Design a protein around this ligand. Structure first.
Ligand SMILES: O=C(O)COCCO
Length: 285
């Protein structure tokens, strides 16, 4: 082992956030070609598989408002995205979109998944789109929530608030910007998010490059989608214009159900869990 003091603190906060999980779960690691990947499993072992991919910097622990509902019907695996601030441990990771799809391939294979439902928010939504485009044979259908780029490039403010996280009151600035009411987030969850931001001496993040993430799919790439997609966006979205995003997605993706949700922004799964929970279920059913 070799975690810094800040790393140990982050791990402790992650474990404390897992107490917000209102159903029985197990934490475990899956070996992939790009390193040990942390997974939280909930739901009946014989139920259809569902894979969750969290938003940037938030980890799999963010699914606490949704997991009781989704877990009732699905064998639900919350996967920590390799290279992001969480419990997954990256090895030899270049950061290309090919690499990331192959990482997720390994996760699927190692969980014994043939086809799966997928839900991804923010960064996880981008991973989801990248995966379903490359490997439609493995995805039954996908719910893409407030995706990182994918349809539109970020507004420049996203870069600024994300960068500002480590300086002075950056965490508070980021959350007040992104959320009309950041008090919808549990204080224990926020403590973890803060500890993540303070943990800076761990794995080095791959420098953003043209062949990596974030990414905006071309017109032709979007037209090529062969998996049903539910796209949920929040009216109060700040990372881009959510109506502009819906317009582009709806213009090109063949099999899409897209909507801009009321009284929610970027982290719509946490702001409107009652609506979002049912809406996703209805789509999968
Ligand atoms: O979108 C988020 O939840 C945090 O992303 C900032 C990246 O450093």
């Amino acid at each position: 082992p070799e975690l810094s003091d800040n790393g140990i603190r982050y791990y402790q906060t992650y474990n404390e956030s897992l107490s917000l999980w209102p159903v029985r779960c197990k934490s475990f690691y899956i070996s992939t070609r790009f390193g040990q990947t942390h997974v939280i499993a909930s739901g009946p072992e014989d139920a259809p598989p569902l894979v969750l991919l969290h938003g940037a910097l938030f980890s799999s622990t963010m699914w606490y408002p949704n997991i009781a509902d989704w877990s009732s019907k699905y064998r639900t695996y919350a996967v920590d995205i390799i290279g992001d601030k969480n419990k997954s441990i990256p090895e030899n990771l270049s950061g290309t979109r090919t690499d990331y799809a192959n990482w997720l391939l390994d996760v699927f294979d190692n969980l014994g998944i043939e086809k799966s439902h997928m839900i991804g928010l923010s960064l996880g939504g981008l991973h989801t789109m990248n995966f379903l485009l490359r490997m439609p044979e493995r995805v039954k259908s996908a719910a893409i929530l407030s995706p990182a780029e994918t349809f539109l490039p970020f507004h420049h403010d996203f870069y600024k608030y994300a960068l500002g996280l480590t300086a002075s009151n950056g965490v508070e600035k980021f959350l007040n910007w992104m959320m009309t009411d950041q008090n919808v987030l549990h204080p224990i969850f926020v403590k973890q998010f803060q500890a993540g931001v303070m943990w800076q001496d761990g794995s080095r993040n791959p420098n953003p490059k043209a062949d990596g993430f974030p990414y905006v799919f071309t017109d032709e790439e979007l037209r090529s989608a062969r998996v049903p997609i539910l796209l949920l966006l929040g009216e109060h979205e700040v990372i881009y214009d959510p109506h502009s995003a819906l317009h582009r997605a709806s213009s090109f993706v063949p099999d899409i159900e897209a909507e801009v949700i009321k009284n929610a922004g970027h982290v719509l799964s946490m702001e409107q869990p009652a609506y979002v929970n049912e809406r996703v279920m209805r789509f999968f059913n």
